[PDB]
Amino acid sequence: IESEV
Amino acid sequence: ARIEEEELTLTILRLGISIAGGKGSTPYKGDDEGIFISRVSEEGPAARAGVRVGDKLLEVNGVALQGAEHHEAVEALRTAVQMRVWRE
């Protein structure tokens, strides 16, 4: 899961 | 003559990164459920501050993310942010 930050 | 692994105290100043992993989600590396830096925009603040893809998020702004859930790692990172990471 690549979450944007 | 080489570096096998190291820990850094990199302080970014706005993030241009994409954290992955976290306990309870398919791990970024083969057997490490820890929070990882998966994508780093070349231009963004994290890039300039020394953050690289593959670094292991250990602590963010004094909060420890060593073995923490995904939203814990995101909540810690969503003006100025200092992160401490492990490399190779």
Author numbering:
A (entry chain D): 20 to 24
B (entry chain A): 720 to 733, 738 to 801, 805 to 814
Text taken from the publication that reported this structure:
Scribble is a highly conserved regulator of cell polarity, a process that enables the generation of asymmetry at the cellular and tissue level in higher organisms. Scrib belongs to the LAP (leucine-rich repeats and PDZ domain) protein family, and features sixteen LLRs (Leucine-rich repeats), two LAP-specific domains (LAPSDa and LAPSDb) and the four PDZ domains (PDZ1, PDZ2, PDZ3 and PDZ4). The influenza A virus NS1 protein was shown to bind to human Scribble (SCRIB) via its C-terminal PDZ binding motif (PBM). Examination of the SCRIB PDZ:NS1 complexes showed that the NS1 peptides are bound in the canonical ligand-binding groove formed by the β2 strand and helix α2.
We determined crystal structures of SCRIB PDZ1 bound to NS1 ESEV PBM (A281-R219-T220-I221-E222-S223-E224-V225), SCRIB PDZ1 bound to NS1 ESKV PBM (A281-R219-T220-I221-E222-S223-K224-V225) and PDZ3 bound to NS1 ESKV PBM (A281-R219-T220-I221-E222-S223-K224-V225). The SCRIB PDZ1:ESEV complex revealed hydrogen bonds between Ser223ESEV-Ile742SCRIB PDZ1, Glu222ESEV-Ser762SCRIB PDZ1 and Ile223ESEV-Gly744SCRIB PDZ1. It appears that the conserved His in each domain found on the α2 helix, PDZ1 H793, PDZ3 H1071 and PDZ4 H1170A is an important position even when this was not obvious from the SCRIB PDZ1:ESEV structure, whereas in the SCRIB PDZ1:ESKV and SCRIB PDZ3:ESKV complexes a clear role for this His could be identified. In the case of the SCRIB PDZ1:ESEV complex, this is possibly due to the crystallographic packing (resulting in a different rotamer for the Ser 223 position in ESEV compared to ESKV), which prevents the Ser hydroxyl group from reaching SCRIB PDZ1 H793 for a hydrogen bond in the SCRIB PDZ1:ESEV complex. However, this interaction may be available in solution, since substitution of the His by an Ala significantly impacts the affinity of the interaction. The PDZ1 mutant H793A abolished binding with both the ESEV and ESKV PBM. The ESEV sequence showed an affinity towards all four SCRIB PDZ domains, with SCRIB PDZ4 showing the highest affinity interaction (KD = 11.8 ± 5.5 µM), followed by SCRIB PDZ3 (KD = 13.1 ± 1.6 µM), SCRIB PDZ2 (KD = 18.7 ± 2.4 µM) and lastly SCRIB PDZ1 (KD = 21.4 ± 1.7 µM). SCRIB PDZ1 displays a higher affinity to β-PIX (3.3 ± 0.3 µM), compared to both NS1 ESEV (21.4 ± 1.7 µM) and ESKV (30.0 ± 0.9 µM) PBMs. SCRIB PDZ1:ESEV and SCRIB PDZ1:ESKV superimposed with SCRIB PDZ1:β-PIX with RMSD values of 0.77 and 0.75 Å, respectively. The −1 position of β-PIX N645 forms a hydrogen bond with S741PDZ1, whereas the NS1 PBM does not interact with SCRIB PDZ1 from the −1 position; instead, the −2 position S223 appears to be the important position, forming a hydrogen bond with I742PDZ1.
